[PDB]
């Protein structure tokens, strides 16, 4: 085919990027994260008990109002690194940037206050492979490919820096290609270890003038649905010792004055070193020594079979425009602009 | 009749106002919000699972200790804009400022951590109409009227500013009239759209030198149980654009230095303009440009049938002593003092 | 009569105190300072040209929009110790906390950026005497006494300490009496040197253990429209030498840790000693040995006839609740609170 | 017997002290609090629904991986002052500082987000008496005594101050004796009211130069599992009035500048006055008057039969090395170092 | 050609702007300031002795690790208005936001602590002309024009205001064009006095309502490598007298509350008036009457031939987006945003 | 003997270090500074008249309430470099971290507000020699050596850096030895010029690269009771000129951003160079280019016989752990930590 579609994304405190989708007839709209680390679509349901306060604070899909609804009802539970949702499968029409696709999704009826009350978004649109689809449900991108309308069998992510401006675009997902207006230089590609996961070989991680981590190679999950760059607890302990960062419950911090002079961190991928400066990974909220500044690098032990692995989320993608190539099973990176 | 009673209220961070009631024989006491936006009485129950941490941190009604208790047991679920509680109905004797009334109330056994762990109060005394009573339970004020002891069929709210002083009264509810010691000038009255809800016509909302909102009239719910003044998401977006406020997850903020010079907001009700200054709607916690200050105006989409509507909570009532007149179905306002 | 009327006041940084008046049918609402150190009422005009950038940033009165406006047009200039305004005389209903009074006042058309860009208030309500009113315009309080509605022929001021951790009342003016909530004990009065100015005899100002200033007496204006306790340049020079304070560049300062070592300052007024501690006169913006802190006492050379005199502004009034007694031409003080 | 074992503890923000234990074959490790205020062992279970986000963020015991596991399955619910957990009993081998003991513990399958998401620890090792054991399960210390290997039938707690250093030990529990390297002077002992609870008579509590609390004697629970020193709501109101502290939802605060000069608090136990200075009970996070500082003394109404009682947690134990003597039923205190 | 290339810039405290370049095969990545006020490229060397403590704390280039390095060794000294570096000439591939260009540059071996310990950047990329290049080394932009890839023969600078409440972009340089996202309206250009320096004629500098400086004209360097607007010592002395500013010890200051009373400063350039308001030129680090605030205008006596001249640095560029037009030997300015 | 005894110390703002002693049977507990620069013990008395406002705000000793008090009554005056106390001699049991010793000390009855209102401690424990004890009262350490309980005849001081983000130990004094936890490596000792004062020969003070002060030698008192490193007025004048520091009003300051450019200060003591970096001697209260920062070095003209001399106070001791060796009349230093 010959079309491409983009969805404009909103950027929330540099930790959540989401766009809009419509479900049903007439469309009921939802803020959703386009997530390469999962493969299911779900949104909160009108059948979700209001004793789930997260459901009181989000848009709820109501099937009783949709003339295009198709019942299925199979239970499913979706497990993420920072929380779990549960509900049941339904089918309806979903619009994503002017593509209309019939799609099986989850109507979530159990949505925990922690963390979903901290979600600006309502739901999730998984962009992973069917291999990782819970309930063996066909993912939305596979369904869009079937239609034979996308110019290429790929999608791309631009994640902007946060703005205080209204007229700064938070991000952009292009279905069927890439926007050259938001990257420069050439794409450089790495092949997936295996089809089924957006995960690649990483040859090394260095902090300053030393490959002190991933010395014998390791795994990098490229996860548009993760806020941060994460690694294993023990990998991160080492990294954070070297930065002189202190561990809290959920994050690491440094004294704010120390932030700007923290060293570079490089990620060795497919023969190119991908390099973040301090400004790229420190929430420089102040310059005061009497204050604490969060780092956009966390600990997360992703379990087998996907893990143990590093994850390269928004912290990484803000620097590097990312293209997900399904036809050739590879990820490409280019300097974002 | 000829009596009136008042209940002294405590003011918590200007967002929660509550007084004491006694339930049972001997009395088991509870901190409760007197709430014109709902019509049921409830308090937390001894039957509430301690897996509900909100129940571990509040006073629990225990029916086994009350010789005046009368079982009913009908389930009920109470839905508020910021959360839900659930339990079952019971009857017992309730004292409110020296009035003793036999009252059906809810013993809540499901009380979500978010938001009820943020409640300084234990329960709620709904002061709305039977028309909005869940379970068609007679509300406490209707039951008090039946006794034929109140001088007038009205109640009134004084909500003070917050104090660092002990000896500042947080607020006052007068059952059966008004305290002229806490208002000045004359009351000015608006008739309810309909008996059944404490909701009136609002002719316009202006921000500075411009009626930019509610240009063709809209609805104002007068809600002693809401912290803030709220309006529809789209009404508020407009208001907040004009103030130069930025939206966060739950609130809007401005830079603190900008607070004092923010413009007036007026609310056109029954032929009088009701005007708040910045000091009335900004939590001026600092004057620093490197800090964020919350506004006591929020977004809340109240659904049909009551909504879509604005709500005029504590932010408004601190400025304006409010009388609720059931005999003549109207709300009156006067400058608080 | 048997009424009083109160206006709640905003405190800006302990240097500006102001509240709401209404002008016109229907009311246009302005922030004003209630100023016992002048005798005219004025607000900025719609006719104020946009050149003066202080008029773009303050609420403007619009005669065309008031059915009770009555033209006068007479020119007038108002000279304060810090800044001068010119404009013309207008008439209308001014509303001040429940009282409605017909009043002549200034529509200010010349509003110098220096200092009125610093003014958080729009205008000024002069509580001084007719003897000092420019244009011999009957001052507002005189006009309100003529109504015969006020219980006593006095008015009172409470100014509060500024607080970042509470949204307390910044202050209160009570027309027609006093509020026992904001003082303790009983008033002791000092008679005016003469009707016409709120000015009393002072019999000494001591610093710790020695009446080292104003032996042989001096004058004290009690000025609710002034931020500070002022004395003459020479007076304050000697006051600061006694305290160990030094001219930074613009203001006098102390090392913040040494503030609590500074001696009590005592103003001998009508037989009694009125004492401010260092906490009451130094802005303990911080307490460290590494910072400097300013004082709430400044040099002000007031010219004849009113000066040379001390002025007792906000600083003093914060400590001592003040009643201005027009019937008896005296001033009452009582502590706190 | 002749052995003693110690477990090194980690100190988290001075509010949680925990060490490591191993459960199962091969060992599955867990961070646990050694808690004299309870008598059960539990850790989170692999059977805990991932809709409990607290279970997503902690180490989960998985019985399917343990060749030493012994099923029992009896339900149990453990109620603490700040929350509840629920699950069922299992038996397995537990290692604590080189002692290996077969132990019945709780596999928790219900673990509320509030407060368990704020737990750095995974589980709890109750060190109380069988008398208070839920399910009449033999506590771990009783089981260790049975082995006849401990030199003395006692255990001891050292709780360090918090450090920014890695190489500062957070705390230490000695099984079978005391470490003289972490105390000085002599132990001074008080007998338990009764065997069954780590609770003693307290003869008085003084704040400054006045026994204003516990004037006629009261109860002190010595609780290694509580963060703070607590007393009854009414006892604490009085204490906090005297310190000039303000009550918030969960804690009390003072202005930070006021912290260092707050008076001493003494606790009269078995004929010695145990004295904390401000530095011992104030989280001195800043010296600024524009900031709030938490006190490590809270309100908690412990119910019958253990209560009403004061609790002496970490705030007290940091100052005083504590020995728990089971053979002679007593608690001993000595100055920590 | 038809390409542009952009480099995203970090803003440190509104006084240092810098971004990423790569040098060598494979790239070694350094932070650099893009400096229209000089014409050489340099980074610190591996050969830089560890004595100069500024070399221990900055990224060092290592020729031995680059397969595209080509020795030159020629000595060179670079004199800035604040500090001097010496070193030797090297050649390699420098990569600048998607463009790869072969370039001669300085390996700096002498790096004085004063001021380079204060330097958040490693090195400097000179965007000035060959006429002013030490050693007559072809400047990087000239070398990039020679590739014939850039769409136009210009480059542009956006410098942003620093913000603690957002992780916004600190700035952007676009090689080969301009980004309409960061200005509004259209450029107006001023021609260079002569090819060779980014220096234009200035026809007046007014303070409010009077061209009181630079009547009879003066020179203005537009210097992206300077923190401030500078003028000559005498010029700035008279500028500060007009503003009411005073020499603290090192810098000129105003009382923070009086900043908003300061007059607009206007630079008459090419027929148009370029105006900074007080918000644009004063560091409102705070707004209180109790604090002093510094200005973003400093005295700098630049020596011949380039000086004596005004310099328009970051302060100016923050207000006016700047395009440097090499084809036409002129400079474009447009507002904001 | 074979014991040591330690007292944990509170750090107030890096300028006052003090801990707990007990006096009387039963103990009355006072905060004291452990002062190697004086030789008497004193606390404030119950007999101290309430005039001296410093006595109302400090713990007072009450002889009437101690069964081990033994009257002496002899008058004594104690002159420190900053302030003077007078009072009378008393005897009692003083308890100091596990040691009980009978001691003669001062009951202070005259306690000048200047400077003792600034004193966070109640009293002083003189660790100097009998030769300098007013009234030739045996100093406390001598009395403790006479017990023959201490393992070695020395005592040691650890002073910590102040921290807002941790409740760390502020310091530690060890009587009878040293704590390897708070230094690294091994002590190197400097012999006393003579028994009787904790004063050593200094062979030079260099600023960066030049012994520009104290060539031809000078004296150094090692004073645990002084906040700073002091030198003579002339000495410090030349020291500050070399650093670029200037007299603000009261203290010397640097621009906070320029602190890290200041040279190492090195004190040549007993053959070795003891070096403080700028981090160790400047109070980096902030790091901005818009703020000024004070130094922890001050001018102090000490009079004969003890002076003129440098004093090495808290500033020095923070860097170098200090052991005072009474057996060998020398002082040991080791780094950190």
PDB file of N, CA, C and O in Angstrom, chain D residues 78-102:
ATOM      1  N   UNK D  78      -2.860 -10.882  60.146  1.00  0.00           N
ATOM      2  CA  UNK D  78      -1.959 -10.227  61.093  1.00  0.00           C
ATOM      3  C   UNK D  78      -2.301  -8.742  61.105  1.00  0.00           C
ATOM      4  O   UNK D  78      -2.275  -8.097  60.057  1.00  0.00           O
ATOM      5  N   UNK D  79      -2.651  -8.205  62.271  1.00  0.00           N
ATOM      6  CA  UNK D  79      -3.083  -6.805  62.373  1.00  0.00           C
ATOM      7  C   UNK D  79      -2.028  -5.961  63.080  1.00  0.00           C
ATOM      8  O   UNK D  79      -1.662  -6.243  64.224  1.00  0.00           O
ATOM      9  N   UNK D  80      -1.522  -4.943  62.386  1.00  0.00           N
ATOM     10  CA  UNK D  80      -0.543  -4.016  62.967  1.00  0.00           C
ATOM     11  C   UNK D  80      -1.172  -2.627  63.062  1.00  0.00           C
ATOM     12  O   UNK D  80      -2.177  -2.348  62.418  1.00  0.00           O
ATOM     13  N   UNK D  81      -0.571  -1.757  63.858  1.00  0.00           N
ATOM     14  CA  UNK D  81      -1.084  -0.415  64.071  1.00  0.00           C
ATOM     15  C   UNK D  81      -1.187   0.420  62.799  1.00  0.00           C
ATOM     16  O   UNK D  81      -2.010   1.346  62.737  1.00  0.00           O
ATOM     17  N   UNK D  82      -0.367   0.106  61.789  1.00  0.00           N
ATOM     18  CA  UNK D  82      -0.333   0.878  60.551  1.00  0.00           C
ATOM     19  C   UNK D  82      -0.807   0.089  59.329  1.00  0.00           C
ATOM     20  O   UNK D  82      -0.746   0.593  58.206  1.00  0.00           O
ATOM     21  N   UNK D  83      -1.272  -1.145  59.531  1.00  0.00           N
ATOM     22  CA  UNK D  83      -1.809  -1.936  58.427  1.00  0.00           C
ATOM     23  C   UNK D  83      -2.012  -3.400  58.732  1.00  0.00           C
ATOM     24  O   UNK D  83      -1.622  -3.890  59.781  1.00  0.00           O
ATOM     25  N   UNK D  84      -2.598  -4.111  57.778  1.00  0.00           N
ATOM     26  CA  UNK D  84      -2.921  -5.519  57.937  1.00  0.00           C
ATOM     27  C   UNK D  84      -2.405  -6.355  56.780  1.00  0.00           C
ATOM     28  O   UNK D  84      -2.432  -5.914  55.642  1.00  0.00           O
ATOM     29  N   UNK D  85      -1.949  -7.573  57.067  1.00  0.00           N
ATOM     30  CA  UNK D  85      -1.667  -8.523  56.001  1.00  0.00           C
ATOM     31  C   UNK D  85      -2.410  -9.788  56.290  1.00  0.00           C
ATOM     32  O   UNK D  85      -2.771 -10.069  57.429  1.00  0.00           O
ATOM     33  N   UNK D  86      -2.586 -10.580  55.248  1.00  0.00           N
ATOM     34  CA  UNK D  86      -3.366 -11.780  55.334  1.00  0.00           C
ATOM     35  C   UNK D  86      -2.762 -12.832  54.415  1.00  0.00           C
ATOM     36  O   UNK D  86      -2.174 -12.501  53.369  1.00  0.00           O
ATOM     37  N   UNK D  87      -2.905 -14.096  54.804  1.00  0.00           N
ATOM     38  CA  UNK D  87      -2.435 -15.198  53.971  1.00  0.00           C
ATOM     39  C   UNK D  87      -2.697 -16.546  54.585  1.00  0.00           C
ATOM     40  O   UNK D  87      -3.777 -16.779  55.080  1.00  0.00           O
ATOM     41  N   UNK D  88      -1.709 -17.434  54.551  1.00  0.00           N
ATOM     42  CA  UNK D  88      -1.857 -18.755  55.152  1.00  0.00           C
ATOM     43  C   UNK D  88      -0.516 -19.299  55.633  1.00  0.00           C
ATOM     44  O   UNK D  88       0.529 -18.919  55.122  1.00  0.00           O
ATOM     45  N   UNK D  89      -0.556 -20.222  56.591  1.00  0.00           N
ATOM     46  CA  UNK D  89       0.663 -20.768  57.193  1.00  0.00           C
ATOM     47  C   UNK D  89       1.373 -21.830  56.320  1.00  0.00           C
ATOM     48  O   UNK D  89       0.716 -22.664  55.708  1.00  0.00           O
ATOM     49  N   UNK D  90       2.711 -21.779  56.297  1.00  0.00           N
ATOM     50  CA  UNK D  90       3.572 -22.814  55.720  1.00  0.00           C
ATOM     51  C   UNK D  90       4.808 -23.035  56.598  1.00  0.00           C
ATOM     52  O   UNK D  90       5.218 -22.151  57.376  1.00  0.00           O
ATOM     53  N   UNK D  91       5.428 -24.202  56.447  1.00  0.00           N
ATOM     54  CA  UNK D  91       6.633 -24.510  57.184  1.00  0.00           C
ATOM     55  C   UNK D  91       7.773 -24.671  56.235  1.00  0.00           C
ATOM     56  O   UNK D  91       7.600 -25.236  55.153  1.00  0.00           O
ATOM     57  N   UNK D  92       8.946 -24.190  56.630  1.00  0.00           N
ATOM     58  CA  UNK D  92      10.161 -24.444  55.851  1.00  0.00           C
ATOM     59  C   UNK D  92      11.358 -24.143  56.736  1.00  0.00           C
ATOM     60  O   UNK D  92      11.199 -23.765  57.893  1.00  0.00           O
ATOM     61  N   UNK D  93      12.548 -24.321  56.193  1.00  0.00           N
ATOM     62  CA  UNK D  93      13.783 -24.076  56.926  1.00  0.00           C
ATOM     63  C   UNK D  93      14.141 -22.587  56.812  1.00  0.00           C
ATOM     64  O   UNK D  93      14.065 -22.012  55.723  1.00  0.00           O
ATOM     65  N   UNK D  94      14.482 -21.950  57.925  1.00  0.00           N
ATOM     66  CA  UNK D  94      14.847 -20.531  57.894  1.00  0.00           C
ATOM     67  C   UNK D  94      16.206 -20.363  58.539  1.00  0.00           C
ATOM     68  O   UNK D  94      16.457 -20.911  59.607  1.00  0.00           O
ATOM     69  N   UNK D  95      17.084 -19.617  57.869  1.00  0.00           N
ATOM     70  CA  UNK D  95      18.413 -19.331  58.358  1.00  0.00           C
ATOM     71  C   UNK D  95      18.380 -17.891  58.825  1.00  0.00           C
ATOM     72  O   UNK D  95      17.855 -17.024  58.114  1.00  0.00           O
ATOM     73  N   UNK D  96      18.905 -17.649  60.027  1.00  0.00           N
ATOM     74  CA  UNK D  96      19.027 -16.316  60.602  1.00  0.00           C
ATOM     75  C   UNK D  96      20.412 -16.247  61.213  1.00  0.00           C
ATOM     76  O   UNK D  96      20.676 -16.913  62.218  1.00  0.00           O
ATOM     77  N   UNK D  97      21.305 -15.472  60.616  1.00  0.00           N
ATOM     78  CA  UNK D  97      22.691 -15.403  61.093  1.00  0.00           C
ATOM     79  C   UNK D  97      23.368 -16.745  61.369  1.00  0.00           C
ATOM     80  O   UNK D  97      23.997 -16.929  62.418  1.00  0.00           O
ATOM     81  N   UNK D  98      23.256 -17.702  60.455  1.00  0.00           N
ATOM     82  CA  UNK D  98      23.907 -19.012  60.676  1.00  0.00           C
ATOM     83  C   UNK D  98      23.214 -20.003  61.610  1.00  0.00           C
ATOM     84  O   UNK D  98      23.650 -21.140  61.740  1.00  0.00           O
ATOM     85  N   UNK D  99      22.142 -19.583  62.271  1.00  0.00           N
ATOM     86  CA  UNK D  99      21.241 -20.521  62.930  1.00  0.00           C
ATOM     87  C   UNK D  99      20.270 -20.990  61.860  1.00  0.00           C
ATOM     88  O   UNK D  99      19.810 -20.179  61.083  1.00  0.00           O
ATOM     89  N   UNK D 100      20.016 -22.298  61.790  1.00  0.00           N
ATOM     90  CA  UNK D 100      19.041 -22.880  60.870  1.00  0.00           C
ATOM     91  C   UNK D 100      17.949 -23.454  61.741  1.00  0.00           C
ATOM     92  O   UNK D 100      18.219 -24.294  62.607  1.00  0.00           O
ATOM     93  N   UNK D 101      16.714 -23.021  61.513  1.00  0.00           N
ATOM     94  CA  UNK D 101      15.580 -23.459  62.332  1.00  0.00           C
ATOM     95  C   UNK D 101      14.411 -23.773  61.420  1.00  0.00           C
ATOM     96  O   UNK D 101      14.184 -23.060  60.459  1.00  0.00           O
ATOM     97  N   UNK D 102      13.705 -24.863  61.701  1.00  0.00           N
ATOM     98  CA  UNK D 102      12.477 -25.201  60.995  1.00  0.00           C
ATOM     99  C   UNK D 102      11.401 -24.317  61.632  1.00  0.00           C
ATOM    100  O   UNK D 102      11.290 -24.258  62.867  1.00  0.00           O
TER     101      UNK D 102
END
